[PDB]
């Protein structure tokens, strides 16, 4: 297929202002009637080009006159000789049961539901499928009453009828103009959890949460989380819901996580259903994060939408930012920041070095569903967070207000948003805008000098962005670079220049610059890039002692964690080198002492201690190398864990027992203690083998909740403990009837350190709880194997690569979106050694030759092979 370019955006030749949809629903054959009110803005000789994919066109009318001046082309219906204003009427057929891709109107179990973002509405009827076309929708739905007792669409339900032959109908009307991507429709049978929420200004909102029959007992957390989201948006952003009714439907077959369709969010049931015996703390916090995210989209995405898809980050970065602020307000800000920074450096940096690298605002897109990315979302959010960092909360809030005042009811661009922040705040963001147009990870180098004569500290900070596959020309960014200076007793030294205060966020705007601070009364240990103030790799020659100093004294929790990460990074590299030469782990005692100090600091938040005692993941430490040796990294993570487990066995078991809790609560203090406790258990599982088998076996049989059961089952697999197969068998036997719970188990299989893991994963393709048609099962088994087991995926014999090729050969035909998610590990080939490159390259070449190669794979495969 063929690329679209951001610089080619033009306002459309036509607008639609109102559309009236009728659906005569049936899974085999749905008939859609679509009456649209349209207007020509372009030249009269310019036809109306309607997108449509896999539609059967039954008829076309223009002001009620059967139209003869039209034709069908590659994925469009083109209509000529139109007046300036007219009513378009289209009747077409689609087939939901055939729709395995889950784009458009498909079937999720017995239910019918939709997914329209980015360009799925065109799989439902011929339309102007692009988000700068906003219209008022009215949606009539007709269906078999026994099979589809609930019939849902956006807005308010405004009519209702029965018919002969056991069929009934409902009609919905949504007063707010929207682009078609936000359209949704659900038909099916559900248990419904109903509650209400009263807004800050008194508006009462009905809340309805639709789940499969039987699951009303895993719903209340999601409902609570929705309410918390609604309250928080009021408190922090001053934003209230704008309709009478908030529906959420939880379906099992879903490609995204969840989707912000106006007043009728549709969710992967993974990000709704929770019970203490089925869901972990991390699940609960995820459901919270995702429910909030779709809710915050009501303003940042719906009330103001995107002019074109290249502007995706206008809504995703800002809505991710909003979900992060919500989680951090209600829980631990530091733990939140830490985890978000682990994601940026672990996963996102890799993408920004890959064939798939793009700016948060892409300039070129072949298939748009390939741009729902770590970059657009997470880096997007970091870019928003830099704006916040430059402006401060009061000014950032004024920008939000101006953004809405200007663009409420319309579609906007990244630049529009950046301008609202500029105009409202008076901070100049012209240079800052470069963050939107430039790909890749900047590298910020820092050199320092202390001068005891003058009591001056000098930072020489310089920056470069290396070239990326997608751009050859790079330039300096506007980098907000936050610092704190610590004196010898751990107290902050004030930042001054010429005896006037100086702001602790430094504007690093040039390729190289020098900052000088006065009255530095003692040689400082610096905290640099404080709270990851910009998404950059930092290069500074730390001594280990500076790093341990920060772990004990730094005032910002995040810096303590981050210093520990920098400390470990040196020894991860050292030990990967040692591994390559057949040597055992080397690890100085002072390093171990530093981590002992954290464990027995009784004034440190247990959640912080827990993150500090969580080792970088294999992906996070792969970022430290040019060539990745994934076997070495895995083997090194294992060894480093054993070593600490031996070195700190007594403290670890003490803290493990100290944070035992008889009550289970989903409350931030309790989650912290359970997180620390289970981090301690993870180490002990890599220690004395009998004690391990006992603790891990006992915890598994004696929880209480899924957080503690999985933490133990998971150590049993990681450390290959004697009790493992039995625990894995209990779990299967209990939980097999339940996919969302089985997903955890598949992930564990797929990420097993054991020897024949691939052979196992293959066989699990036949497991009772696995199915190739459910994106969740695919992501847990196959996706976890390829993405999170790089020691087995990258076996020297190329067997992991061919396994993926098999799976992709299937999924390219079945579900291109899921397939594109799965291919990502294979297009990282240039970070591996030559032998691995050749084989990976070979596998991409095999997939490049598939009949009916999907656009989604195509785009990634050609970039990887270029």
| Sequence-separated contacts (24+) of 192-196 with Cβ below 8 Å | 192/150, 193/219, 193/220, 193/223, 195/223, 195/227
Residue 259 marked in a binding site:
yes
- Reading the block at residue 163, the tokens are 């018919």
* Among residues 134, 304, 391, 610, the one that binds Na ion under rule CB under 5 A: 134
Per-residue CA distances from 646 to 127, 565, 602, 611, 660 (Å): 65, 20, 22, 19, 22
Residue 258 marked in a binding site:
yes
Shortest Å distance, C-beta 780 to Zn ion: 22
Catalytic residue among 119, 208, 288, 294: 294
Number of helical (H) and strand (E) elements in the chain, helices listed first: 29, 35
Residue 680 contact among Na ion, Zn ion, none, beta carbon within 5 to 8 Å by kind: none
Between 174 and 316, CB nearer to Zn ion: 316
Shortest Å distance, C-beta 16 to Na ion: 6
Shortest Å distance, C-beta 269 to Zn ion: 18
Residue 668 marked in a binding site:
no
Between 15 and 228, CB nearer to Zn ion: 228
Residue 17 contact among Zn ion, Na ion, none, beta carbon within 5 to 8 Å by kind: Na ion
Q: Is 325 a catalytic residue?
A: no
Per-residue CA distances from 564 to 524, 571, 596, 653, 735 (Å): 18, 11, 12, 21, 38
Residue 117 marked in a binding site:
yes
Shortest Å distance, C-beta 141 to Na ion: 23
Shortest Å distance, C-beta 560 to Na ion: 17
Between 295 and 549, CB nearer to Zn ion: 295
Residue 297 marked in a binding site:
yes
Contact 336, 378 (CB under 8 A): no
Convert 240-276 to b/e letters by CB count within 10 Å (16 or more is b): bbbbebbbbbbbbbbbbebbbbbbbbbbbbbbbbbbb
Residue 235 marked in a binding site:
no
Give the per-residue contact string, 311-350, with Na ion (x = CB under 5 A; - = no): ----------------------x-----------------
Task: Give the Cα separation of 454 and 450 in Å (integer).
Answer: 9
Contact partners, residue 504, CB within 8 Å, separation at least 6: 482, 483, 484, 495, 530
Q: Residue 76 CA to chain centroid, in angstroms? A: 32
Contact flag: residue 228 with Na ion (CB under 5 A): no
Of 373, 386, 214, 234, the closest CA to residue 299 belongs to 234
Stretch that binds Na ion, among 17-25, 164-172, 485-493, 554-562 (CB under 5 A): 17-25
Residue 134 contact among Na ion, Zn ion, none, beta carbon within 5 to 8 Å by kind: Na ion
Residue 15 contact among Na ion, Zn ion, none, beta carbon within 5 to 8 Å by kind: Na ion
Between 232 and 404, CB nearer to Na ion: 232
Stretch that binds Na ion, among 132-140, 264-272, 360-368, 694-702 (CB under 5 A): 132-140
* DSSP-assigned letters across all residues of 496-513: EETTEE--SEEEE-SSEE
Q: CA angle, 469 as apex, 465 and 470 as ends, to 5°?
A: 85
Stretch that binds Zn ion, among 103-111, 138-146, 316-324, 394-402 (CB under 5 A): 316-324
- Residue 109 gets the label, from left (phi > 0), alpha (psi -120 to 50) or beta, of left
* Among residues 15, 471, 704, 846, the one that binds Na ion under rule CB under 5 A: 15
Per-residue CA distances from 320 to 83, 313, 323, 324, 405 (Å): 43, 9, 5, 6, 21
Of 354, 558, 500, the closest CA to residue 441 belongs to 354
Shortest Å distance, C-beta 706 to Zn ion: 27
Total residues binding Na ion (CB under 5 A): 4
Per-residue CA distances from 821 to 208, 567, 778, 816, 818 (Å): 32, 33, 10, 9, 5
Between 633 and 672, CB nearer to Na ion: 672
Stretch that binds Zn ion, among 116-124, 134-142, 312-320, 682-690 (CB under 5 A): 312-320
Stretch that binds Zn ion, among 315-323, 454-462, 468-476, 801-809 (CB under 5 A): 315-323
Residue 319 contact among Na ion, Zn ion, none, beta carbon within 5 to 8 Å by kind: Zn ion
Task: Give the Cα separation of 751 and 743 in Å (integer).
Answer: 12
Contact 844, 827 (CB under 8 A): yes
Between 92 and 348, CB nearer to Zn ion: 348
Shortest Å distance, C-beta 380 to Zn ion: 10
Q: What is the DSSP letter of 108?
A: E
Contact flag: residue 17 with Na ion (CB under 5 A): yes
Between 49 and 333, CB nearer to Na ion: 333
Residue in the structure block whose two tokens are 């799976």: 807
* Among residues 99, 115, 153, 319, the one that binds Zn ion under rule CB under 5 A: 319
Between 225 and 675, CB nearer to Zn ion: 225
Three-state secondary structure call for residue 370: helix
Binding residues for substrate: 117, 257-261
Binding residues: 117, 257-261, 293, 297, 316
Residues labelled catalytic? 294
| Site for Na ion, rule CB under 5 A | 15, 17, 134, 333
| Site for Zn ion, rule CB under 5 A | 316, 319
Binding residues for Zn(2+): 293, 297, 316
């Amino acid at each position: 297929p063929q690329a679209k370019y951001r610089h080619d955006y033009r306002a459309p030749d036509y607008q639609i202002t109102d559309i009236d949809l009728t659906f005569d629903l049936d899974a085999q054959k749905t008939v859609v009637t679509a009456v649209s009110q349209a207007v020509r803005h372009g030249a009269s000789d310019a036809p109306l080009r309607l997108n449509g994919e896999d539609l059967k066109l039954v008829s076309v009318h223009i002001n009620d006159e059967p139209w003869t001046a039209w034709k069908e082309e590659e994925g469009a219906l083109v209509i000529s000789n139109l007046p300036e204003r007219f009513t378009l009427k289209i009747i077409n057929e689609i087939s939901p049961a055939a729709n395995t891709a889950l784009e458009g109107l498909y079937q999720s179990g017995d239910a019918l539901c939709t997914q329209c973002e980015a360009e799925g509405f065109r799989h439902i009827t011929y339309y102007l499928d692009r988000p700068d076309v906003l219209a008022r929708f009215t949606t009539k739905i007709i269906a078999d009453k026994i099979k589809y007792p609930f019939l849902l669409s956006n807005g308010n339900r405004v009519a209702q009828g029965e018919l002969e032959n056991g069929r009934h109908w409902v009609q919905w009307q949504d007063p707010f103009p929207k682009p078609c991507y936000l359209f949704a429709l659900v038909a099916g049978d559900f248990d419904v959890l109903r509650d209400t929420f009263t807004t800050r200004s008194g508006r009462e909102v009905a809340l309805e949460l639709y789940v499969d029959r039987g699951n009303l007992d895993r719903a209340p957390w999601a409902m609570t989380s929705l309410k918390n989201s609604m309250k928080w948006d009021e408190e922090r952003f001053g934003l209230e819901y704008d309709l009478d009714i908030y529906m959420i439907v939880a379906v099992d077959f879903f490609n995204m996580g969840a989707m912000e369709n106006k007043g009728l969010n549709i969710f992967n049931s993974k990000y709704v259903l929770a019970r203490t015996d089925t869901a972990t703390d991390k699940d609960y916090l995820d459901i919270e994060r995702v429910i909030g995210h779709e809710y915050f989209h009501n303003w940042t995405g719906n009330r103001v939408t995107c002019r074109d898809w290249f502007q995706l980050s206008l809504k995703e970065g800002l809505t991710v930012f909003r979900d992060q602020e919500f989680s951090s307000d209600l829980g631990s800000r530091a733990v939140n920041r830490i985890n978000n920074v682990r994601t940026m450096r672990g996963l996102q940096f890799a993408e920004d070095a890959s064939p798939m690298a793009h700016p948060i605002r892409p300039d070129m897109v072949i298939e748009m569903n390939n741009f729902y990315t770590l970059t657009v979302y997470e880096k997007g959010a970091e870019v928003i967070r830099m704006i916040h960092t430059l402006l401060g909360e009061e000014n950032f809030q004024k920008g939000m207000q101006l953004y809405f005042e200007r663009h409420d009811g319309s579609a906007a661009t990244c630049d529009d948003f950046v301008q609202a922040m500029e105009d409202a705040s008076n901070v100049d963001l012209s240079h800052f805008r470069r963050w939107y147009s430039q790909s890749g990870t900047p590298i910020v180098t820092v050199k320092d000098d202390y001068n005891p004569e003058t009591e001056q500290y000098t930072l020489t900070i310089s920056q470069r962005t290396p070239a990326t596959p997608d751009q050859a020309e790079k330039q300096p960014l506007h980098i907000p670079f936050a610092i704190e200076l610590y004196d010898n007793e751990g107290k902050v030294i004030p930042l001054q220049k010429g005896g006037h205060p100086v702001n602790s966020v430094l504007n690093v705007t040039q390729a190289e610059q020098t900052f000088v601070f006065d009255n530095v009364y003692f040689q400082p240990v610096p905290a640099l890039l404080c709270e990851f103030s910009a998404p950059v790799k930092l290069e500074y020659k730390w001594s280990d002692q500076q790093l341990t100093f920060l772990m004990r004294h730094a005032r910002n929790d995040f810096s303590r964690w981050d210093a520990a990460q920098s400390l470990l990074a040196t020894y991860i590299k050292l030990n990967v080198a040692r591994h390559q030469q057949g040597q055992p782990l080397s690890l100085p005692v002072h390093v171990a002492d530093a981590f002992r100090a954290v464990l027995l600091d009784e004034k440190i938040d247990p959640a912080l201690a827990a993150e500090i005692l969580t080792l970088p993941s294999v992906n996070e430490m792969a970022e430290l190398f040019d060539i990745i040796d994934p076997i070495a990294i895995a083997e090194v993570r294992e060894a480093l864990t054993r070593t600490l487990a031996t070195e700190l066995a007594d403290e670890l078991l003490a803290i493990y027992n100290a944070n035992y809790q008889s009550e289970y609560r989903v409350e931030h203090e309790d989650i912290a203690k359970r997180t620390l406790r289970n981090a301690c258990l993870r180490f002990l599982a890599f220690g004395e083998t009998h004690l391990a088998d006992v603790l891990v076996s006992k915890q598994f049989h004696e929880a209480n909740n899924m957080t503690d059961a999985l933490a133990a089952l998971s150590a049993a697999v990681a450390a290959q403990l004697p009790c493992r197969d039995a625990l894995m068998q209990e779990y299967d036997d209990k939980w097999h009837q339940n996919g969302l719970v089985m997903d955890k188990w598949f992930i564990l299989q797929a990420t097993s350190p054991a020897a024949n893991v691939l052979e196992t994963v293959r066989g699990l393709l036949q497991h009772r709880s696995f199915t190739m048609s459910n994106p969740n099962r695919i992501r847990s088994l196959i996706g976890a194997f390829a993405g999170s087991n790089p020691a087995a995926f990258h076996a020297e014999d190329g067997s992991g690569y061919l396994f993926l090729v098999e799976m992709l050969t299937d999924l390219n035909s079945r579900n291109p979106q899921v397939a594109s998610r799965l291919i990502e590990p294979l297009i990282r080939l240039k970070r591996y050694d030559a032998k691995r490159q050749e084989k990976m390259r070979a596998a991409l070449e095999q997939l490049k030759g598939l009949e009916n190669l999907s656009g989604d794979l195509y785009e990634k495969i050609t970039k990887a092979l270029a």
